[PDB]
Design an enzyme around this catalytic site. Structure first.
Site, PDB file in Angstrom:
ATOM      1  N   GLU A  15      14.179   1.191   0.232  1.00 36.52           N
ATOM      2  CA  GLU A  15      13.408   1.568  -0.947  1.00 36.52           C
ATOM      3  C   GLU A  15      14.296   1.716  -2.182  1.00 36.52           C
ATOM      4  O   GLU A  15      13.927   1.260  -3.272  1.00 36.52           O
ATOM      5  CB  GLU A  15      12.657   2.870  -0.679  1.00 36.52           C
ATOM      6  CG  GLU A  15      11.496   2.746   0.305  1.00 36.52           C
ATOM      7  CD  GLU A  15      10.308   1.936  -0.211  1.00 36.52           C
ATOM      8  OE1 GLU A  15      10.299   1.508  -1.386  1.00 36.52           O
ATOM      9  OE2 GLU A  15       9.382   1.681   0.583  1.00 36.52           O
TER      10      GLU A  15
ATOM     11  N   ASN B  67       5.255  -0.914 -10.563  1.00 37.72           N
ATOM     12  CA  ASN B  67       4.308  -1.601  -9.700  1.00 37.72           C
ATOM     13  C   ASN B  67       3.371  -2.463 -10.538  1.00 37.72           C
ATOM     14  O   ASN B  67       3.202  -2.249 -11.740  1.00 37.72           O
ATOM     15  CB  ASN B  67       3.495  -0.608  -8.875  1.00 37.72           C
ATOM     16  CG  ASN B  67       4.367   0.269  -8.003  1.00 37.72           C
ATOM     17  OD1 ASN B  67       5.266  -0.220  -7.322  1.00 37.72           O
ATOM     18  ND2 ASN B  67       4.110   1.565  -8.023  1.00 37.72           N
TER      19      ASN B  67
ATOM     20  N   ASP C 221       0.232  -2.522 -10.750  1.00 34.52           N
ATOM     21  CA  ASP C 221      -0.904  -1.829 -11.350  1.00 34.52           C
ATOM     22  C   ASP C 221      -0.505  -0.904 -12.495  1.00 34.52           C
ATOM     23  O   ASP C 221      -1.367  -0.185 -13.011  1.00 34.52           O
ATOM     24  CB  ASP C 221      -1.676  -1.058 -10.271  1.00 34.52           C
ATOM     25  CG  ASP C 221      -0.890   0.108  -9.686  1.00 34.52           C
ATOM     26  OD1 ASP C 221       0.302   0.274 -10.015  1.00 34.52           O
ATOM     27  OD2 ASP C 221      -1.469   0.846  -8.864  1.00 34.52           O
TER      28      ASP C 221
ATOM     29  N   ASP D  77       7.313   3.729  -9.058  1.00 33.87           N
ATOM     30  CA  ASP D  77       7.910   4.350  -7.880  1.00 33.87           C
ATOM     31  C   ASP D  77       9.235   4.987  -8.283  1.00 33.87           C
ATOM     32  O   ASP D  77      10.036   4.360  -8.979  1.00 33.87           O
ATOM     33  CB  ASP D  77       8.171   3.316  -6.778  1.00 33.87           C
ATOM     34  CG  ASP D  77       6.903   2.845  -6.079  1.00 33.87           C
ATOM     35  OD1 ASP D  77       5.810   3.373  -6.352  1.00 33.87           O
ATOM     36  OD2 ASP D  77       7.011   1.935  -5.229  1.00 33.87           O
TER      37      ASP D  77
ATOM     38  N   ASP E 253      -0.556  12.245   5.584  1.00 34.60           N
ATOM     39  CA  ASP E 253      -1.887  11.995   5.040  1.00 34.60           C
ATOM     40  C   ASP E 253      -2.687  10.970   5.832  1.00 34.60           C
ATOM     41  O   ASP E 253      -3.758  10.561   5.377  1.00 34.60           O
ATOM     42  CB  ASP E 253      -1.810  11.584   3.556  1.00 34.60           C
ATOM     43  CG  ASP E 253      -1.321  10.149   3.327  1.00 34.60           C
ATOM     44  OD1 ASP E 253      -1.244   9.323   4.273  1.00 34.60           O
ATOM     45  OD2 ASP E 253      -1.020   9.835   2.153  1.00 34.60           O
TER      46      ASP E 253
END
Ligand code: CL
Ligand code: CL
Ligand code: NA
Length: 128
Positions: free
Chosen positions: A35, A46, A48, A52, A101
């Site tokens: 990462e 990103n 959209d 990050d 989650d």
């Protein structure tokens, strides 16, 4: 801060990530390698428009506030800049929420594509 491999393993372990939600320490070190290359200051935009942040590339779309992701959430209740600190506490606490989650570490695309199913213990081999 650019962590050494074993240096990051020790910090992650001290903060309780080893076997958190069943994910051994090597999974977390491998995810951080791909990462961020172990760099707390890493940022990536990103498609959209979200970003990050940090050693585990936590996404402003859901987890932190950066003031420029219109319509996003801040589920870890932190500024995204806190995820760039040399102290990884904020990133670990937020990563614990993410991995709890429902989808586990599949939340990290680099983990799914580059760590999952591999010999992740290699990433902590040789460390004290
Ligand atoms: Cl491991
Ligand atoms: Cl899981
Ligand atoms: Na946000």
């Amino acid at each position: 801060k650019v962590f050494g491999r074993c240096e990051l393993a020790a910090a992650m372990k001290r903060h309780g990530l080893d076997n958190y939600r069943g994910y051994s320490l090597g999974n977390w070190v491998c995810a951080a390698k791909f990462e961020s290359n172990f760099n707390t200051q890493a940022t990536n935009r990103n498609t959209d428009g979200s970003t990050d942040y940090g050693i585990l590339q936590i996404n402003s779309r859901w987890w932190c506030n950066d003031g420029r992701t219109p319509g996003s959430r801040n589920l870890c209740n932190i500024p995204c800049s806190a995820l760039l600190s040399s102290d990884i506490t904020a990133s670990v606490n937020c990563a614990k929420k993410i991995v709890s989650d429902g989808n586990g570490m599949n939340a990290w695309v680099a983990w799914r594509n580059r760590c999952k199913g591999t010999d992740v213990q290699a990433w902590i081999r040789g460390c004290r």
